[PDB]
Design a protein around this ligand. Structure first.
Ligand SMILES: CC/C(=C\SC[C@H](NC(=O)CC[C@H](N)C(=O)O)C(=O)NCC(=O)O)C(=O)c1ccc(OCC(=O)O)c(Cl)c1Cl
Ligand SMILES: CC/C(=C\SC[C@H](NC(=O)CC[C@H](N)C(=O)O)C(=O)NCC(=O)O)C(=O)c1ccc(OCC(=O)O)c(Cl)c1Cl
Lengths: 208, 208
């Protein structure tokens, strides 16, 4: 079945985990500790010397977005046609761009850059609110009327940002309702409330 | 047909341009100058306030990789099956990671970080050489036996790096032969030698 190999943090696996759970999929968690990593063995066997590492049968994958896309392709969470597929990518790419800045803050200069980051947030979130207003008034999903991997990724982005800047979604009604709505999905809700998710720090340096 | 809207630099459009050309596709180039951009009008109309912007009929896209994936999906440059598709993403994601570091150097600290960057290059390129050795001895493409958007993106990455660190491919025979082989493809060769490509600086700050 599936197996996600990662450190004991949500980080870049949070979204794909939400997806699997929400899709009623089963997966094995291979937890890697700082000690096991600093040993070098696993690091060397990784294509880009990094985790997450993913296994689907004998198919070994690396890169969180490759996992996301893979799951979306095989599970039918990639749009109804080529057009929607492109729109899904567009959203995911934007999520990725913002996640990189987030990651950079968290690990590069949390204390010095938090203010500037939070000041810039509105403008970084605005694109997703706009996307929402152009798709059935933000009533359904980020693209089309069926959920996609971009949704789970955007949801996570949103969630981690609420922790970073409590209330950053107040100025974005569609996003706020979107988070609540998605978070309310039965399987997802149960997952999000489970110790498996709740007891994992968002990041590995203790900053959030 | 297609229309790529960007600044007069190769940057994030180089790959997708190589693709179109190589695939015998026709496209219109909407050149945006620093003045036109600093006017703010076009910037505001862009989803993430950035270029490249792409048009395929009435489908407007943003994010270079979304364009790459879109073209790969519609032109059949995305693997022969879901498995290869995942592998293609995996390669592209790695290219993207390295391109971000490259971009960062070029615009953030070219003078101070060039040495450290060039010292780290071998390790950053190693993954692509390995990928190649696992696919028919690196005789065909980065994934499978048919070309994919990841190829054009990886090719560009390789090309810009040779300029950055002349000879960085000497330690990688498969990559070297790969670059030559791909660069030799008729339509691509003609494009690469054309003024349309040759007379465009790689980056917008004059550093390469
Ligand atoms: C969310 C931020 C985090 C990235 S995951 C860990 C990192 N892997 C990647 O960055 C993969 C990026 C790919 N493009 C992708 O999958 O999309 C990694 O493998 N780091 C280890 C290494 O040696 O490279 C991150 O930046 C980060 C940094 C440091 C730690 O560890 C601190 C600790 O717990 O002591 C973690 Cl856990 C993370 Cl997540
Ligand atoms: C190759 C590096 C380059 C990025 S493209 C220009 C930039 N757009 C993006 O970064 C989009 C990112 C998406 N994830 C993607 O398409 O992949 C952009 O629109 N910049 C303008 C803006 O105000 O946002 C880059 O970093 C860069 C930086 C500066 C300039 O201009 C200098 C000059 O000529 O005076 C350029 Cl042209 C570029 Cl390309």
């Amino acid at each position: 079945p599936y197996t996600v190999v990662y450190f004991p943090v949500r980080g870049r696996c949070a979204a794909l985990r939400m997806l699997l759970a929400d899709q009623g999929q089963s997966w094995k968690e291979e937890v890697v500790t700082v000690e096991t990593w600093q040993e070098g063995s696993l690091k060397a066997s990784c294509l880009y010397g990094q985790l997450p590492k993913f296994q689907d049968g004998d198919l070994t994958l690396y890169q969180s977005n490759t996992i996301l896309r893979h799951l979306g392709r095989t599970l039918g969470l990639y749009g109804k046609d080529q057009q929607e597929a492109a729109l899904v990518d567009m959203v995911n790419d934007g999520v990725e761009d913002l996640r990189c800045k987030y990651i950079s803050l968290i690990y590069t200069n949390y204390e010095a850059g938090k203010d500037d980051y939070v000041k810039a947030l509105p403008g970084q979130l605005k694109p997703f609110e706009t996307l929402l207003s152009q798709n059935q008034g933000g009533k359904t999903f980020i693209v089309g009327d069926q959920i996609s991997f971009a949704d789970y990724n955007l949801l996570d982005l949103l969630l981690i940002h609420e922790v970073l800047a409590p209330g950053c979604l107040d100025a974005f009604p569609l996003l706020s309702a979107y988070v609540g709505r998605l978070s309310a999905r039965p399987k997802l809700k149960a997952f999000l409330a489970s110790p498996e998710y709740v007891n994992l720090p968002i990041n590995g340096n203790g900053k959030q």
